[PDB]
Scaffold this active site. Sequence first.
Site, mmCIF file in Angstrom:
data_model
loop_
_atom_site.group_PDB
_atom_site.id
_atom_site.type_symbol
_atom_site.label_atom_id
_atom_site.label_comp_id
_atom_site.label_asym_id
_atom_site.label_seq_id
_atom_site.Cartn_x
_atom_site.Cartn_y
_atom_site.Cartn_z
ATOM 1 N N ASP A 1 0.839 -1.197 0.000
ATOM 2 C CA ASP A 1 0.000 0.000 0.000
ATOM 3 C C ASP A 1 0.876 1.250 0.000
ATOM 4 O O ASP A 1 1.341 1.681 1.061
ATOM 5 C CB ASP A 1 -0.898 -0.005 1.236
ATOM 6 C CG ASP A 1 -1.833 1.184 1.287
ATOM 7 O OD1 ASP A 1 -1.925 1.900 0.271
ATOM 8 O OD2 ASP A 1 -2.457 1.407 2.359
ATOM 9 N N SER B 152 -0.480 15.696 -12.062
ATOM 10 C CA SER B 152 -0.696 15.337 -13.452
ATOM 11 C C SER B 152 -0.937 16.596 -14.278
ATOM 12 O O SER B 152 -1.468 17.597 -13.791
ATOM 13 C CB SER B 152 -1.888 14.380 -13.550
ATOM 14 O OG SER B 152 -2.269 14.139 -14.886
#
EC number: 3.4.23.22
Length: 330
Positions: free
Chosen positions: A35, A199
């Site tokens: 994770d 992004s």
Amino acid sequence: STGSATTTPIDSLDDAYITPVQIGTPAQTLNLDFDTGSSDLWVFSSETTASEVDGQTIYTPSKSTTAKLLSGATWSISYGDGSSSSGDVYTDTVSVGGLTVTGQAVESAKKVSSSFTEDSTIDGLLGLAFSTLNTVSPTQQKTFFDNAKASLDSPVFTADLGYHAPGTYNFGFIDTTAYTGSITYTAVSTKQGFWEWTSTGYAVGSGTFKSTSIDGIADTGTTLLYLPATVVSAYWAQVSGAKSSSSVGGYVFPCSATLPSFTFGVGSARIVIPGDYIDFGPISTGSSSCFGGIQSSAGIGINIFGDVALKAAFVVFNGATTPTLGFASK
């Protein structure tokens, strides 16, 4: 040193991935959920409340000659999906894919919430975010990667998750045969303890690319892609009959649909998520309403590049003094 381990989807939807981890002496092998959105290595154990164990493999520290109680240390964690677990702490030897750390904090669960009990395939979590998020008190502990870093050939790990298929976590090296083209690296902020990046924009299907900054986290422990409501609405508007359902808890679409791809930007590069990766199947057995793999982050407080996005790429988690993330097509 290096390590290399195969990671395998837990079910036919790629809801999560499990990777075998050796703990203790002699080894006890548990299948853990790696994770990158948390920083605790915790396991089902001989100390877990018996009614909360249902098929998982347990770590028994009393059978490990290298286990030692970390006296006074406790832990307690809550995840973004509302699940939680807590307990006490041992140190022991932990190996992943041939890479061994001695003295790793292994957090033994005394209590786990229902979603963990109900998932017999996941024996615990192995956190790979930054150690500033680790929940052990009163002495915070280091992640497996942080402990191994100095011994690694290069201070990196990579995630190569499969679509309906096994993949690979590598530690300490970049397998240049595992991706196509070049790797594009992008800056990371560690201010919230996550692999947080920006992004450069998105496209829906064959549509034109929209240049826009989207801050979010690279999170292997989250199944879906969670993005701003504007972006998610633009995506689902291209699917006939798709709608956001408050009763179901997100966007659903007719199971008869063919889904468009979704592209996200990494600097000047582009990662394409095929439409099939966004199909999470019937909302309930036999339903013709299917659950979407791209969902709004509006109720979370952060955008999350979960498995839906990451499994379309070869992803480098660069833990150098100034961390960065790398993405390549594959």
